[PDB]
Design a protein around this ligand. Structure first.
Ligand SMILES: [Zn+2]
Lengths: 7, 195
């Protein structure tokens, strides 16, 4: 799983 | 949090945090570890037991062999930003990777704190078995997920609302108080999660 920060 | 507990958490992080090879900002790396040390020790110990590494980087995430496959890939929720993973300074989930110097809101992201937000993803996925997608948290997210701003990201993905709420809870006393006022059910949920 990969998740980014808030744009 | 007393001095002994902060020190214990830093000791735990010493077995989790990986520094880049070559030149990098040592003082800012240390500051990032100090901010991570405010996370409840129960979560840090679980990350250590699962051999989760918090990789601090001096360059782009996609310059690391294990993230090269994300070159040119637009992250979930970043549609229309014109950015790809090449441009994103932090990643969390099954791993954690963080660009040194990009902690603060506005440094290529709008999270309240990069390392706490990214590490929250790993705690959610690895330590808590995707609790952000549980029925309980989805019901909380349905009510409060649009009260922290960035509603087309935090209000749409429960795992992102969890990660950002976690960052508010653990960054400092001010952000902790803001979360309690904006998202009281989320705040109580996180409070009880740490018991
Ligand atoms: Zn995120």
């Amino acid at each position: 799983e990969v998740n980014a920060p808030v744009p | 949090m007393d001095s002994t507990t902060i020190q214990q958490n830093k000791d735990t992080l010493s077995q989790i945090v990986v520094f880049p090879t070559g030149n990098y900002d040592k003082n800012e790396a240390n500051a990032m570890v100090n901010r991570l040390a405010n996370i409840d020790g129960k979560y840090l110990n679980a990350l250590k037991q699962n051999n989760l590494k918090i990789k601090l980087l001096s360059g782009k995430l996609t310059d690391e062999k294990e993230y090269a496959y994300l070159k040119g890939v637009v992250p979930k929720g970043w549609e229309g930003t014109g950015k790809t993973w090449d441009d994103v300074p932090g990643l969390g989930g099954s791993t954690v990777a963080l660009r040194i110097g990009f902690s603060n809101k506005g440094k290529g992201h709008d999270a309240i704190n990069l390392e706490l937000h990214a590490t929250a993803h790993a705690i959610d996925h690895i330590v808590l078995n995707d609790i952000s997608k549980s029925a309980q948290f989805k019901q909380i997210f349905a009510k409060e997920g649009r009260s922290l701003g960035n509603v087309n990201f935090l209000g749409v993905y429960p795992e992102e609302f969890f990660a950002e709420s976690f960052a508010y809870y653990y960054l400092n006393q001010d952000t902790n108080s803001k979360l309690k006022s904006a998202c009281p059910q989320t705040y109580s949920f996180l409070q009880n999660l740490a018991k």
